Design a protein around this nucleic acid. Structure first.
Ligand SMILES: [Zn+2]
Ligand SMILES: [Zn+2]
Ligand SMILES: [Zn+2]
Lengths: 77, 153, 97, 124, 713, 48, 252
DNA sequence: TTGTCTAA
DNA sequence: TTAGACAAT
């Protein structure tokens, strides 16, 4: 039972692509085929269009509770 | 060399002071082992043995059954060096000051006697016991820096 | 200067929570929806009635942008169009509030 | 005006500034304001904590003072069989002096409230 | 290596029980000599090595670490007598003017001090529904049977304040709300003010003792100098009798009156007290000379006690008497000079104390804690430029061989960092400052290539502080910043042999710039998440509107509102080579085929039109899969502006049907109308605003950029 | 204390023993934290 | 305006004297410019200004100067940083016996400072050069002070000042340094009708719109400084300077 | 220069 | 009910 926005917001996409781009750097393994760029932000943003980023988000409701949404299932704009 | 040898060939008989049980750790893991976490955790623990800390009080010598704790790993604010926690049936060693261990001699002279405990502990044993000029017990035990433990006595 | 600084430091915490209620930096509920309807100020520019002919054309250009609304889930208007027909029935029988 | 790995001052070791050469660039109160209004918490974290006076601090999780831990001297055993541990004097215990990440200006705030006989509990 | 992960949850700052500091301390100091004549820090002094070390070439005396990683060691200046606590002095005088001499109770009636004692332990739980219930039931009780015989508690007030603590037992955590701390500040301020009137003692019918505060340093009892050594014996016996209420006023730590009275002053660590030179008084620090004055007066009082063991104190006011209250008020004012300088208005030889370090706008909370001077930032002059994009900035070469960004080595970026190490830190195709696996760095130079290539063979087999390139983000800042688009994140571009920063014309309506030597701060986000929220959230293209009303504020300013009214007028006619030059001037490195149009006049000559050049540009800058936009509307030039003759009214023709007022773009192609400020300026509901609310940000940045490059060329 | 008159509010935050749980943007930069803003309103996990 | 201040640069010791190499008298000037004979000290150079929105960098109070015309000498300048150096008002430790001098065997002053401790005349100075050296006469230990300014400069002349009696010891000096200070990007010009324009971009001469007479312009000025500021006087000055240079006249 | 807080 | 006191631009 999870009732929040099904849409990924902008800040969600910023932190997911930031950490995922740092989850590419320091020899970290990549899960899509690449045309050969060296900027990790392009790599992490191509996995967002791939829906291959496995990250689960703990959206803190103000009680202290949270829902576990998945970037695989969140609808980008 | 830290030798496994079928869970140390069960040297937890009498006269050896070591206790083996489950624990709880805090492993700070690199993002290069996102996939293939098993060799990452066990390689970091191989790069963790033979020194002292608090959750593994005295010193370890082996470990088995590394099982991860929980479903979700923790990614912090800016770091990205992901933090997992481990419960595992450790084989660790309590040094127990006031006990008697074994010795394998390799470098011995009139100034000092070098003997080894478990083939890993470079224990420097002083040769004179103030008896005469013509010629073990434990009182102080402290580790060295680079991945080894030392015994004075 | 000073006036803007004080209005800043008495309004630094009013972030919008996931349940869309404007709460302070401790849980204190100010508003139940932001701005009494829930919207945003940048994204309300093409909602005015004079910019509805612009959205009457360009319909396929925005269908391409996001197409949750026709053949995808979470787009059931039953519980809300029921509610609006209830309200318009109440104004049909009780005109003067 | 270009700044990288510049000289910090001895109190509050952030870059110096001060109407001369080798001085850093102030971020500012209204920039704090506007950058919170953007919603980018981490660029503010970068430009306000990660790039100026980031320090590691040691607290006992039991009590919670930045003053109470005290590190021993190395033994005279000549860099062999040496400990290099911490000792919380208020607890007299060799456990749970954990590390945290707080600004060095905040450590001057804590060791300067101690001049005013105030101590802060940190929930760690 | 071994960085801290353990975060925080909440802080709470209270006071010192004076036993704790003598265990936290290191040394009793008692020596008025800072440094020796050579520069050696003096033994047992205020800058002793047993405190936090002051130099970088002598280790401290307690620890055997350097100045770099020392925590900070504090000592104590012990006092011969007791002084007041200046933090609690203005709440000490408010207790003693309500207390009594022989009986150690107070003059407040018992109904009030029961009502507050019951209301405070309700607001610890954070009930706040019972703070009217308690006054309702105690007014009902006092109406039923008024008596002082309820000495400890009333039965129903105490019964309800036990039931309200038992219900919601874990309510220590639900009391961070504004409304709870509102009533808790209001009621305690009402008890400090309204029910603390100095009056006679009500229960034992005994004459009271009234104290008076004068010049914020002396307490005069009325039968007059009350010594703090006797205020110890007053306050202790007062608190052992009224602790069950004065521990609910004062939460604190068990809260004893060792915090109202100071028996020793504690010094901060000497690393936090820096050295100072070249002033009116040299070689002095303020919080060191205040404690110097204190320690000199402590030497004076030990001289006085040496005299009273069975001149030497001609310097105090009354040298003839043997007792000297005046030296004791001298020491207590020196303690006030340490903690503050607003409470002393007398002594001319003082420096500002720890209140003045913290409170005002040039302090810490508004000068060093909320806004900090930052590394990896640049400040330069801005000038116009237009051959950069709107989401772009030109970073002079000098900045680009001096601003360097960190990058770890993946297998993907071995070769480019290898080339950057090959370059060396002056030459910019990208250059380097590489730091090894530990904290040791290389900081490679450009004097020799052999060391650089020897490092460059060992990159993958170590991160590199590589220089800024033509895709990196700099965060741009022009003070004063009054609104949200006043700090945006522009993509860098490295332009050779420059001195000034360079911006497009759409952005200096947001930054409120005027291109007249307005100097601009360019922060460079060093981390990697700080890149990502700058590409996504703080991007220039994404913030096209204003937070005030949502009107646009990115547009084209001066030459372009003339070229658009000249070019998209009906009269222009281009031939084939002029058209194919203008279309490619509007574009630059469009990745695909340029999708050209047909001539508007096919015979006698292939004449294009000025409107088809803008249309060709739109169809080429709208993305590949997205179909172009429709639009209609109205422009800034009216229909009365194109008139030259006197208009004749033809019978069946409305002239606005065929007029140049109406911009009637169809399928992304202009078919009527003149483009003005009303369609690609800062004016709302135009072409570059519709392209923002259909296609997004980067396309609506490309429309402004490409229509600038077209209308200049 | 950061807003105005820090000495009086440290007096009224030490006499009363006030504790704050660090959910404010003005407090989350006094200590080194990330505010409850846009990109600090949630934390972030990896499954397995 | 950086103009020609004065004729005697050698015996005046101001802090900054902004000099303009080759100023010109204006062709279109009022009668009060000659009633007071201001041609003793002229302040600006004439310029062939063309009012065109040609480049793209020519907007919002900025302008375009021809690059080759900048290279040939257009509004070149100098600024004379003079610095009165006294060895008792600044350097005071003991006995005040400080004269300028070099101690023989000091490699810090080899070929950079002269044998008296003062630098040479004509010697260029950069950031990090020895600036002067002074010899404590009682011990023999000479010190050195370094040139801690950012700019590059040339020592124009050095004057050795005594005291008001005539018996002062060799301890006061006043070094005067030329600093070139040519037009760079960001140097604000103006006409005589109060219309400032910052220098935005030096545009090369082959790119300049040449006229029908063979002339490139000299400074490109925007048409978009005119409708809000209403300087009709600049247009009549433009027509009048053109009609005065075409005839040899000087116009009232 | 306000505007509330404190003391007579 | 009204004068000193305290902080900010
Ligand atoms: Zn502790
Ligand atoms: Zn130390
Ligand atoms: Zn009494």
């Amino acid at each position: 039972k999870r009732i929040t926005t099904p849409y990924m917001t902008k800040y969600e996409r910023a932190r997911v692509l930031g950490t995922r781009a740092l989850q590419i750097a320091m020899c970290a393994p990549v899960m899509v085929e690449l045309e050969g760029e060296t900027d990790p932000l392009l790599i992490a943003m191509k996995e967002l269009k791939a829906r291959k980023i496995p990250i689960i988000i703990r959206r803190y409701l103000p009680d202290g509770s949270y829902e576990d949404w998945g970037v695989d299932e969140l609808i980008i704009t | 060399l830290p030798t496994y040898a079928a869970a140390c060939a069960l040297v937890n008989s009498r006269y050896s002071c070591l206790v083996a049980g489950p624990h709880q750790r805090h492993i700070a893991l690199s993002p290069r082992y996102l996939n293939r976490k098993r060799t990452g955790i066990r390689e970091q623990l191989d790069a963790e043995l033979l020194r002292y800390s608090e959750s593994l009080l005295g010193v370890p010598i082996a470990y088995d059954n590394i099982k991860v704790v929980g479903e979700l790993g923790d990614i912090y604010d800016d770091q990205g060096h992901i933090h997992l926690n481990i419960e595992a049936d450790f084989v660790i060693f309590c040094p127990e000051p006031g006990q008697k261990l074994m010795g394998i001699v390799n470098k011995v002279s009139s100034s000092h006697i070098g003997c080894l405990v478990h083939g890993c502990f470079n224990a420097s044993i002083p040769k004179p016991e103030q008896l005469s000029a013509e010629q073990f017990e434990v009182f102080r035990l402290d580790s060295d820096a680079a991945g080894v433990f030392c015994i004075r006595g | 200067g000073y006036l803007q600084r004080c209005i800043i430091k008495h309004l630094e915490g009013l972030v919008v929570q996931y349940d869309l209620t404007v709460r302070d930096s401790d849980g204190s509920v100010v508003q139940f929806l932001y701005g009494e309807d829930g919207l945003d100020i940048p994204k309300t520019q093409f909602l005015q009635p004079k910019q509805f002919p612009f959205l009457a054309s360009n319909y396929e250009v925005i269908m391409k942008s996001q197409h949750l609304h026709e053949v995808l889930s979470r787009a059931d208007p039953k519980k809300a169009l029921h509610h609006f027909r209830a309200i318009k029935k109440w104004q049909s029988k009780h005109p003067n509030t | 005006q270009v700044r990288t790995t510049g000289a910090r001052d001895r109190v509050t070791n952030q870059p110096i500034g001060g109407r001369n050469v080798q001085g850093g660039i102030r971020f500012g109160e209204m920039e704090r304001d506007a950058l919170l209004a953007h919603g980018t918490s981490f660029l503010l974290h970068d430009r306000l904590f990660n790039c100026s006076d980031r320090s590691v601090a040691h607290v006992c999780v039991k009590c919670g003072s930045l003053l109470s831990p005290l590190l021993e001297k190395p033994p005279p055993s000549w860099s062999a069989m040496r400990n290099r541990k911490y000792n919380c004097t208020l607890c007299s215990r060799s456990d749970t002096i954990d590390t945290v990440s707080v600004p060095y200006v905040f450590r001057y705030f804590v060791a300067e409230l101690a001049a005013m006989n105030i101590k802060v509990k940190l929930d760690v | 290596k071994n960085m801290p992960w353990r975060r925080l949850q909440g802080i709470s700052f209270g006071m010192y029980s004076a036993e704790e500091l003598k265990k936290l301390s290191v040394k009793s100091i008692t020596n008025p000599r800072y440094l020796d004549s050579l520069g050696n820090p003096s033994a047992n002094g205020l800058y002793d090595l047993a405190l936090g070390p002051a130099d970088s070439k002598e280790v401290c005396s307690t620890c055997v670490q350097d100045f770099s990683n020392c925590s900070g060691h504090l000592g104590h200046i012990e006092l011969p007598l007791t002084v007041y606590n200046p933090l609690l002095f203005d709440k000490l005088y408010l207790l003693l003017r309500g207390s009594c001499l022989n009986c150690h109770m107070l003059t407040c009636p018992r109904a009030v001090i029961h009502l507050l004692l019951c209301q405070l332990r309700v607001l610890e739980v954070g009930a706040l529904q019972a703070v009217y219930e308690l006054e309702r039931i105690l007014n009902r009780f006092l109406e039923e049977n008024p008596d002082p015989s309820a000495s400890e508690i009333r039965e129903e007030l105490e019964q309800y304040t036990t039931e309200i603590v038992q219900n919601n037992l874990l309510g220590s955590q639900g009391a961070h709300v504004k409304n709870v701390c509102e009533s808790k500040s209001k009621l305690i301020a009402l008890f400090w003010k309204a029910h603390m009137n100095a009056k006679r003692c009500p229960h034992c019918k005994t004459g009271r003792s009234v104290v008076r505060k004068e010049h914020n340093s002396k307490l005069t009892i009325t039968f007059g100098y009350l010594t703090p050594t006797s205020a110890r014996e007053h306050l202790s016996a007062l608190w052992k009798n009224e602790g069950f209420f004065l521990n609910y006023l004062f939460s604190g730590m068990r809260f004893n009156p060792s915090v109202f009275f100071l028996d020793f002053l504690v010094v901060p660590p000497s690393r936090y007290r820096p050295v100072s030179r070249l002033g009116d008084q040299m070689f002095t620090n303020g919080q060191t000379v205040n404690l110097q004055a204190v320690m000199k007066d402590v030497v004076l009082i030990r001289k006085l006690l040496a005299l009273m063991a069975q001149f030497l104190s001609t310097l105090p006011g009354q040298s003839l008497i043997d007792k000297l209250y005046n030296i004791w008020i001298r020491l207590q004012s020196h303690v006030n000079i340490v903690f503050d300088s607003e409470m002393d208005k007398l002594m001319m030889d003082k420096y500002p104390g720890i209140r003045q370090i913290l409170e005002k706008k040039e302090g810490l909370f508004r000068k060093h804690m909320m806004g900090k001077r930052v590394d990896y930032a640049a400040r330069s002059v801005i000038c116009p430029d237009m051959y950069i994009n709107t989401n772009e900035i030109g970073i002079p070469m000098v900045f680009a061989t001096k601003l360097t960004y960190p990058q770890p080595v993946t297998p993907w970026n071995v070769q480019e960092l290898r080339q950057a190490v090959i370059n060396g830190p002056n030459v910019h195709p990208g250059a380097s400052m590489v730091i090894n696996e530990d904290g040791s760095r290389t900081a490679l130079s450009a004097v020799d290539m052999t060391q650089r290539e020897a490092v460059a063979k060992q990159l993958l087999t170590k991160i590199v502080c590589r220089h800024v390139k033509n895709g990196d983000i700099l965060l741009l800042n022009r003070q004063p910043t009054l609104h949200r688009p006043s700090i945006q994140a522009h993509r860098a571009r490295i332009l050779p042999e420059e001195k000034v920063l360079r911006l497009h014309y759409a952005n200096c309506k947001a930054y409120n710039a005027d291109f007249d030597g307005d100097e601009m701060n360019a922060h460079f986000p060093q981390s990697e998440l700080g890149r990502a929220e700058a590409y996504v959230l703080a991007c220039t293209d994404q913030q096209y509107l204003v937070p005030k009303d949502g009107q646009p504020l990115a547009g084209l300013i001066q030459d372009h509102m003339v070229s658009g009214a000249s070019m998209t007028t009906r009269g222009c006619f281009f031939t084939r080579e002029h058209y194919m030059e203008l279309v490619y001037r509007g574009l630059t490195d469009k990745v695909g085929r340029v999708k050209l149009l047909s001539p508007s006049i096919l015979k006698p000559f292939p004449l294009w039109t000025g409107k088809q050049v803008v249309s060709t540009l739109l169809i080429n800058i709208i993305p590949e899969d997205h179909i172009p936009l429709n639009l209609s509307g109205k422009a800034k030039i009216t229909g009365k502006a194109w008139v030259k003759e006197t208009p004749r009214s033809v019978p069946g023709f409305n002239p606005d049907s065929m007029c140049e007022s109406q911009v009637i773009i169809r399928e992304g192609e202009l078919l009527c109308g003149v483009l003005d400020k009303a369609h690609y300026g800062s004016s709302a509901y135009g072409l570059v605003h519709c392209c923002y609310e259909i296609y997004g940000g980067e396309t609506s940045g490309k429309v402004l950029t490409c229509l600038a490059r077209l209308f200049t060329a | 204390m950061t807003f105005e008159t820090s000495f009086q509010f440290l007096k009224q935050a030490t006499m009363l023993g006030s504790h704050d749980e660090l959910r404010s943007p003005s407090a989350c930069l006094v200590v080194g934290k990330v505010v409850r803003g846009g990109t600090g309103l949630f934390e972030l996990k990896q499954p397995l | 305006t950086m103009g020609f201040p004065l004729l005697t640069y050698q015996d005046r010791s101001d802090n900054k004297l902004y000099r303009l190499q080759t100023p010109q008298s204006p062709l279109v000037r009022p009668s009060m410019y000659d009633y007071y004979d201001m041609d003793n000290y002229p302040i600006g150079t004439n310029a062939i200004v063309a009012v065109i929105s040609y480049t793209g960098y020519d907007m919002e109070d900025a302008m375009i100067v021809n690059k080759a015309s900048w290279e040939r000498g257009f509004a070149h300048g100098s600024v004379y940083k003079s610095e009165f150096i006294d060895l008792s008002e600044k350097i005071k430790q003991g006995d005040s016996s400080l004269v300028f001098g070099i101690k023989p065997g000091d490699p810090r002053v080899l070929q950079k400072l002269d044998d008296d401790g003062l630098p040479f005349i004509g010697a260029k100075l950069q950031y990090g050069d020895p600036y002067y050296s002074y010899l404590n006469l009682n011990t023999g230990e000479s010190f050195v002070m370094y040139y801690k300014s950012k700019e590059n400069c040339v020592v124009d002349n050095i004057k050795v000042c005594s005291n008001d009696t005539g018996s002062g010891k060799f301890k006061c000096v006043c070094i005067t340094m030329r600093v070139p200070r040519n037009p760079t990007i960001g140097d604000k010009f103006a006409s005589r009708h109060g219309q400032k324009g910052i220098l935005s971009r030096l545009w090369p001469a082959e790119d300049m719109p040449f006229t029908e007479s063979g002339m490139v312009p000299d400074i490109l000025f925007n048409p978009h400084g005119f409708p809000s500021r209403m300087t009709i006087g600049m247009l009549i000055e433009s027509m009048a300077g053109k009609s005065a240079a075409l005839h040899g006249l000087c116009h009232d």
